[PDB]
Amino acid sequence: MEMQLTPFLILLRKTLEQLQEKDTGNIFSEPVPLSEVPDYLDHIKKPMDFFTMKQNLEAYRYLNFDDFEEDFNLIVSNCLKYNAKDTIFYRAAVRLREQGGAVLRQARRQAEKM
C-alpha cells in the first residue's frame, strides 16, 4: 500500500533531485511552452519535464522504479525527436541521457536493496 511505499518514494524524491541537477541549461524543468512551440503536440504524444515528474511523484503516479525511469526517458527522447541534431536542445538531451543514466543506474541498485 501507499504507507509501505514511503521509503521507496523517499528514494525517488532524492533520485529526481539528482536528475534535475543535471539540467544545467534549465531547459528540462518546466513543460515545453506551447505558447512558444505551438506545434509541439503535433509531434510529441506525451510531453515530460522535471516539474511534471515532481507533480507525478507527489501524486502517487510512480509506484515502481520502471514507471519513474520511463518518464525520465521521455524527457530525453521527446527532445531528440522534436529537435534537429545541430541544436542546443539535441546536444543537451544527449548530455542529459548520459548523466541522468548514471544517476538512475545507482538509484536502481539502491531500490533493489528495498
Ligand X SMILES: COc1ccccc1C(=O)Nc1cc2c(cc1N1CCCC1)n(C)c(=O)n2C
Chain positions contacting ligand X, by CB under 6 A: 27-28, 30, 32-33, 36-37, 79, 82-83, 89
Comparing CB distances to ligand X, the nearer of 65 and 72 is 72
Q: Provide the CA 16 distance to its chain's centre, in angstroms.
A: 8
Comparing CB distances to ligand X, the nearer of 8 and 90 is 90
Q: How far is the CB of 63 from ligand X (least distance, A)?
A: 27
Comparing CB distances to ligand X, the nearer of 91 and 108 is 91
CA distance 26 to 53: 15
Nearest alpha-carbon partner for 67 in 81, 78, 52, 56: 56
CB 19 within 8 A of CB 50: yes
Q: How far is the CB of 87 from ligand X (least distance, A)?
A: 8
Q: How far is the CB of 59 from ligand X (least distance, A)?
A: 22
Comparing CB distances to ligand X, the nearer of 15 and 78 is 78
Instruction: Give me the phi and psi of 21, to 5 degrees please.
Output: -65, -20
Q: How far is the CB of 62 from ligand X (least distance, A)?
A: 21
CB 18 within 8 A of CB 105: no
The C-alpha cell of 15 is what? Answer: 533520485
